[PDB]
Amino acid sequence: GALLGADELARYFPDRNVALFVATWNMQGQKELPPSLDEFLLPAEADYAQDLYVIGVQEGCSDRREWETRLQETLGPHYVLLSSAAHGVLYMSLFIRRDLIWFCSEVECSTVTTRIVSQIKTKGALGISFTFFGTSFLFITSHFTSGDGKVAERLLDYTRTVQALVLPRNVPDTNPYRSSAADVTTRFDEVFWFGDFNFRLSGGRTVVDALLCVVDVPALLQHDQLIREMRKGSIFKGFQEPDIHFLPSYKFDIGKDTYDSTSKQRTPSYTDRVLYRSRHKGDICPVSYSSCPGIKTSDHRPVYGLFRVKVRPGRDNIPLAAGKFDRELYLLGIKRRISA
């Protein structure tokens, strides 16, 4: 049958569910990476093999290749880099099980800059999309406008991004009649948008400090701007977020578990989030959603979600990856594992 058809799908996914790991991390431009990425990429409850890893980074380390090399080395030879992209120091890397490269369309990327901050600094989005068998996926990572009082600007970051991301292009929309011209996130079966959205907890440092003294997370989240704005429909229309059971992932003193003890007294906040949307209700099942407290090189902790996503058979008359991946990186990862 077709490379991307029902027979192949049966061989590789009898239950038609794909295991996806999606993470976002703001690195604060740090030069030295954590000693081990094992706790980042293989979290404790990730007690089963992931099919796809998608890693979005904001304020990324200058040596993008070294970061990708360490990811490749940690995942090991069962995974290959299906795609990676950069828009300034905003990065995204997509690693997939090597036997699954055959079922992917060509991978397409797009970028949007939503705010010029200075001559050398901007905020924006990086989107990567491809079809897997017959099901299309769109991954967007973003760094939104910063500041407690800048919700209105964050709304504009959302709107500018869904209006401007030029995806898909060569690879056909899988359900075009369902698509809207004004929102790129309507053009795909499964959408994940993860980043430093910079939404904060309202109420001020003193009130949030009081709440953090067991922590009642639900009560804490009553102060979250992002849940508030999503609830009234002003942002991320059609998206959901998994339940949060972890503590705020920002702002931390470097290398420590204490929240910003400088005079600026930034209110601990859930700046880093993973959101999902699907064309078909129920296609995406969150399995776990958490931060990685052991990664402490940056003022932000990484945040990741594990998901199970439904996939459907496809056809071969689209532009195909057909075994295309970063072979040089793959070899570098092999080389590093021989060394260590």
Half-sphere exposure of 240 (CA within 13 A, CB side): 15
The 3-state DSSP class for residue 222 equals coil
- Comparing CB distances to Cl ion, the nearer of 17 and 122 is 122
Number of residues that bind Cl ion (CB under 5 A): 10
Q: Which stretch binds Cl ion (CB under 5 A): 46-54, 64-72, 159-167, 328-336?
A: 159-167
Quick one: three-class SS letters along 50-77? CCEEEEEEECCCCCHHHHHHHHHHHHCC
By the rule CB under 5 A, 166 interacts with Cl ion: yes
Element containing residue 190 per DSSP (H, E): strand 190-196
Task: Output the residue with the shortest Cβ distance to Cl ion.
Answer: 110
Peptide bond into 313 cis (omega under 30): no
- Comparing CB distances to Cl ion, the nearer of 57 and 100 is 57
Element containing residue 125 per DSSP (H, E): strand 121-132
Choice from 110, 136, 267, 269 touching Cl ion (CB under 5 A): 110
What span, in angstroms and rounded, lies between the C-alpha atoms of 165 and 184?
Answer: 6
Bridge-based pairing state of the strands 284-291 and 303-310: antiparallel
Q: Which stretch binds Cl ion (CB under 5 A): 35-43, 55-63, 249-257, 317-325?
A: 55-63
For residue 245, what are the contacts with CB-CB under 8 A and spacing of at least 6?
A: 217, 289, 290
User: Going residue by residue from 122 to 151, which x/- string records binding to Cl ion, judged by CB under 5 A?
Assistant: ---------------------x-xx-----
Q: Which stretch binds Cl ion (CB under 5 A): 67-75, 158-166, 276-284, 320-328?
A: 158-166
Q: Which stretch binds Cl ion (CB under 5 A): 79-87, 115-123, 238-246, 311-319?
A: 115-123
CB 89, min distance to Cl ion, A: 5
User: Residues, the chain, total?
Assistant: 340
Element containing residue 288 per DSSP (H, E): strand 284-291
What span, in angstroms and rounded, lies between the C-alpha atoms of 329 and 72?
Answer: 7
User: Going residue by residue from 210 to 249, which x/- string records binding to Cl ion, judged by CB under 5 A?
Assistant: ----------------------------------------
CB 266, min distance to Cl ion, A: 14
CB 285, min distance to Cl ion, A: 30
- Comparing CB distances to Cl ion, the nearer of 60 and 242 is 60
CB 260, min distance to Cl ion, A: 18
CB 188, min distance to Cl ion, A: 16
The 3-state DSSP class for residue 168 equals coil
CB 108, min distance to Cl ion, A: 9
Burial class (CB in 10 A: 0-12, 13-18, 19+), 118: exposed
CB 29, min distance to Cl ion, A: 9
By the rule CB under 5 A, 58 interacts with Cl ion: yes
If one counts every other C-beta atom within 10 angstroms of the C-beta of residue 38, the result is 11
- Comparing CB distances to Cl ion, the nearer of 195 and 333 is 195
- 130, two tokens: 């491809």
DSSP state of 33: P
By the rule CB under 5 A, 116 interacts with Cl ion: no
CB 148, min distance to Cl ion, A: 12
What span, in angstroms and rounded, lies between the C-alpha atoms of 257 and 250?
Answer: 10
CB 65, min distance to Cl ion, A: 17
Interface with Cl ion by CB under 5 A: which residues?
Answer: 58-59, 89-90, 110, 117, 143, 145-146, 166
